[PDB]
């Protein structure tokens, strides 16, 4: 195994790609970093349902044959909240807003755990919440908390 | 705001958030006082009574700042007179414009 | 015999070593880097590199043709090297700034006092500031 | 129904099928079958 | 596949017998003209051999290019992904048609010659502005109006479902439909039942979201909007709250009111252009009918003008019966006391009082709604 | 509740180990024992005590009062789940399971505490539950069980400073280090 590395280390590098979506006859559509989209094939050890849209891949460079699925990258929302960096909160840091907790649970908490409970009354579920008052009163930590 | 946003069928619930009273200025000092290295005997009730209801953000604005007093006199335990040394400064900024 | 082959593998290093940067690895001893040419690659290693010397931002080494991992590098930055400290201070004293008693003491609280007395901020636990923004009218 | 189905049972034997990603019908292209495959490609340049 | 469109008959007719037996003539005679192919000259399979001959012409590195012009003798200038364009030739399996300037194509890796064309994954904006499913219940949900329902079915539904009445008359349907009145009167709620009723492709846009921050992106959004509206088939375009383009000024728009103005010029074109318009119906709604340009309100651009009055009290009780249909109404309540609570209450006011009264029941975990829930419900909803 | 619960075990020491001094300790220890619903921890202390022949009705009124708190939990678990709060079954017995910790033995404590440990997503309840497991870990001298929830405890104080949950905790490690002969 040590001796083989003198010979095998004589190959080229493998490109990285990005599957947009697959099409007919064992082929996919893959873009590079700053290099245009290519309609390439797949190798025999790769399944089409295993090929997910919006996923990186390893690619060979000589014939642009598919090599291996690159783990993952990001959601377009995980990066978003990562940029925003909201102060994550909980009930254990609420200072004396206990009736307002009970008010927001009726609007938000109930039509998640028990949506049928409103069809027991035949009314539609609420959609919009307005929180008002002076700044510095717990709005952001409350909405983050719920 | 908009009267079209004040259509009664539009908004489902509006919730008011008052500034805290003497009862609700105490517990934000209580939860906020968790991560500080204190000194036994503080009487947080008096400290909550020294603030006549600014908001829930001046609670952290005082009690985070009180560690700078114990640190600038090189303590390892935050004492009660740091807090009354802080309320008259942050509330001086309440007295600023 | 294994000591003979042990030195033999480093011939790929030479001088023209690819200057990339480590990003991650799929598995044991096969990784993914990004070159200084602008593109990324799925590369192999050389076995004698201590893998525990990896993953901050230290620039790795790549072969210019076969393009695999060659050698780990000490860090480099061209920008402003390190402020060469001899003819680099602008020799302004604290006494040269008159009338800034609040802000001169206050930036001392935030910058070099956690630098020196770290365990007071650690022991009281008051979360010393990461960065600082300063502004105002010019001059 | 058997003759409307037998329509499909021989039109699959003709070759119009394999719904493409941008190909021609398989009878349409036979100009470039043997001559222009090695004539419109191998002598021909790009001429950018 | 589009073999014979004569599917009239609708009984046991001999024409049906002899015509299907003459399809049996073109298929029995010429299935005996299908046998002989590989019997005489095998020479290949032709099911995959010539197919893999094309697939051995074209390489696996299929670069994706872009059209910008066509010269007919199978060579054209195509755009690379870099931008450095070429003057390559065009193959014979390219089915010389689905080729428009701007189309995504498939090129060679070596000489970049035009190998194939590419199906377009469209643009997300169509899925954004396109309503997928039926929103809610039918016109029986509405109640009390009953006059302009015949008007909207008159201008929209009846031209679609019955293309006989206009042809026996020798006439065309009216073009533009506009809806106006007080707010909360059910203007959007009617379009909900229209989106239930129709089978045409339905588009919906708010008049607030027309405006932009860049210059001309408004009128360009109009042009591609009516492009999307035409390029399907029979379609209905709905515009909500078009006074908001003229009332509110925002500082995101770099141009002032003389950019909104030019957007109104482009839309003013797109209602009554000289071009062949097609089967695109336009339904609009606002509450400030007096503010906008009367040049857009002229007959020819909008033909039908529909006002929604306030609900009279006998229609109010019907709306109460609607929004209190499937709820467990305790017999404590009298709806007639709830009628004259507000002299000019909208239909949204009734539904808001009902839903908030249900919220007051669910505060106390009950199943029925009592009278005091309405008594403090009108205080909560109305008086603030 | 577990806040006066160390004086109980110290007075069990005061009952058992001074042999001549075992009269006022079994008087005041009974004064605390056959009230406040205590059932389990004094049968063998009754064996080390005298006969106390008619304790049957004394046990019956208190297993009955224990049955009252058990059956009102059994009246709470189905109303709590009908319109759910923050798992209000485990929110009721996350407070009354310490009552079951004093009154019952450690089992109805432990399955309800490791039960409710997964309920609250912040440590403001969790670390107090772990403090309760520490305090009963002293009571049954659970010298192996204290080693777990000491480290599992200390794994929570790093987020935040929590000095009423660290300096208070140092009292527990100090009483353990003086329980064992680790004076320095
Ligand atoms: N004690 C002082 N306080 C304020 N200004 C002073 C003081 N001593 C000298 N100055 C003058 O003020 C100027 C401060 O220079 P500096 O470049 O820091 O200004 P600045 O606040 O950075 O404004 P700018 O960003 O426009 O340069 C100096 O040019 C100096 O002449
Ligand atoms: N005549 C009516 N009968 C029953 N319900 C009604 C009636 N009018 C309005 N509603 C209810 O009130 C709500 C609001 O109505 P709608 O959205 O049509 O108001 P609108 O006039 O379109 O407001 P805008 O056009 O300013 O957005 C609807 O969800 C609908 O259920
Ligand atoms: N009830 C409370 N308990 C603890 N901290 C609070 C409370 N209310 C407000 N705060 C403090 O205020 C901050 C959150 O402010 P908030 O009012 O949620 O944001 P905004 O000012 O945007 O509404 C937190 O960092 C917190 O320290
Ligand atoms: Mg509306």
From Swiss-Prot, chain C:
Family statement: Belongs to the AAA ATPase family.
Record text on subunit structure and interactions: Component of the 19S proteasome regulatory particle complex. The 26S proteasome consists of a 20S core particle (CP) and two 19S regulatory subunits (RP). The regulatory particle is made of a lid composed of 9 subunits, a base containing 6 ATPases including PSMC4 and few additional components. Interacts with NR1I3. Interacts with PAAF1. Interacts with TRIM5. Interacts with ZFAND1.
Signal peptide: none
Protein function: Component of the 26S proteasome, a multiprotein complex involved in the ATP-dependent degradation of ubiquitinated proteins. This complex plays a key role in the maintenance of protein homeostasis by removing misfolded or damaged proteins, which could impair cellular functions, and by removing proteins whose functions are no longer required. Therefore, the proteasome participates in numerous cellular processes, including cell cycle progression, apoptosis, or DNA damage repair.
Domain of life the protein comes from: Eukaryota
Primary gene name: PSMC4
Compartment annotation: Cytoplasm; Nucleus
Residues of the full protein shown: 71 to 209 of 418
Protein name, as recorded: 26S proteasome regulatory subunit 6B
UniProtKB/Swiss-Prot annotation, chain D:
Subunit structure: Component of the 19S proteasome regulatory particle complex. The 26S proteasome consists of a 20S core particle (CP) and two 19S regulatory subunits (RP). The regulatory particle is made of a lid composed of 9 subunits, a base containing 6 ATPases including PSMC2 and few additional components. Interacts with NDC80/HEC; this interaction is detected only during M phase. Interacts and SQSTM1. Interacts with PAAF1. Directly interacts with TRIM5. (Microbial infection) Interacts with HIV-1 Tat.
Post-translational changes noted in the entry: Monoubiquitinated by RNF181.
Family in the record: Belongs to the AAA ATPase family.
Function in brief: Component of the 26S proteasome, a multiprotein complex involved in the ATP-dependent degradation of ubiquitinated proteins. This complex plays a key role in the maintenance of protein homeostasis by removing misfolded or damaged proteins, which could impair cellular functions, and by removing proteins whose functions are no longer required. Therefore, the proteasome participates in numerous cellular processes, including cell cycle progression, apoptosis, or DNA damage repair.
Parent-protein residues present: 50 to 97 of 433
Intrachain disulfide bonds: none
Top-rank taxon, per record: Eukaryota
Name of the protein: 26S proteasome regulatory subunit 7
Subcellular location: Cytoplasm
Induction, per UniProt: Expression is not cell cycle-dependent and occurs throughout the cell cycle.
Swiss-Prot record, chain E:
SMART domains named among the record's database cross-references: AAA
Segments of skewed composition (Basic and acidic residues): 41-58
Membrane topology listed for this record: Lipid-anchor
Record GO terms (molecular function): ATP binding; ATP hydrolysis activity; proteasome-activating activity; RNA binding
Covalent cross-link (Glycyl lysine isopeptide (Lys-Gly) (interchain with G-Cter in ubiquitin)), residues: 192
Pfam family membership, one: Prot_ATP_ID_OB_C
Residue segments, region Disordered: 39-59
Residues the record lists as Phosphothreonine modifications: 8
Chain positions recorded as ATP binding sites: 181-188
GO biological process terms held by the UniProt record: proteasome-mediated ubiquitin-dependent protein catabolic process
Keywords, sorted A to Z: Acetylation, ATP-binding, Cytoplasm, Deafness, Intellectual disability, Isopeptide bond, Lipoprotein, Membrane, Myristate, Nucleotide-binding, Nucleus, Phosphoprotein, Proteasome, Ubl conjugation
Gene Ontology annotations for the cellular component aspect, listed alphabetically: cytosol; membrane; nucleoplasm; nucleus; proteasome accessory complex; proteasome complex; proteasome regulatory particle, base subcomplex
Modified positions (N6-acetyllysine) in chain numbering: 213
UniProt subcellular location: Cytoplasm; Nucleus; Membrane
PANTHER family on file: 26S PROTEASOME REGULATORY SUBUNIT
Disease tied to this protein: Birk-Aharoni syndrome: An autosomal recessive disorder characterized by failure to thrive, severe developmental delay, intellectual disability, spastic tetraplegia with central hypotonia, chorea, hearing loss, micropenis and undescended testes, as well as mild elevation of liver enzymes.
Similarity comment: family membership: Belongs to the AAA ATPase family.
The protein's name: 26S proteasome regulatory subunit 4
Originating organism: Homo sapiens
Recorded name of the encoding gene: PSMC1
Curated annotation (Swiss-Prot), chain F:
Name of the gene this protein is made from: PSMD6
Protein name, entry field: 26S proteasome non-ATPase regulatory subunit 6
UniProt function note: Component of the 26S proteasome, a multiprotein complex involved in the ATP-dependent degradation of ubiquitinated proteins. This complex plays a key role in the maintenance of protein homeostasis by removing misfolded or damaged proteins, which could impair cellular functions, and by removing proteins whose functions are no longer required. Therefore, the proteasome participates in numerous cellular processes, including cell cycle progression, apoptosis, or DNA damage repair.
Keyword annotations from UniProtKB, A to Z: Proteasome
UniProt GO BP: proteasome-mediated ubiquitin-dependent protein catabolic process
Assembly and oligomerization: Component of the 19S proteasome regulatory particle complex. The 26S proteasome consists of a 20S core particle (CP) and two 19S regulatory subunits (RP). The regulatory particle is made of a lid composed of 9 subunits including PSMD6, a base containing 6 ATPases and few additional components.
Family in the record: Belongs to the proteasome subunit S10 family.
First and last residues shown, out of full length: 12 to 195 of 389
GO CC, alphabetical: cytosol; extracellular region; ficolin-1-rich granule lumen; nucleoplasm; proteasome accessory complex; proteasome complex; proteasome regulatory particle; secretory granule lumen
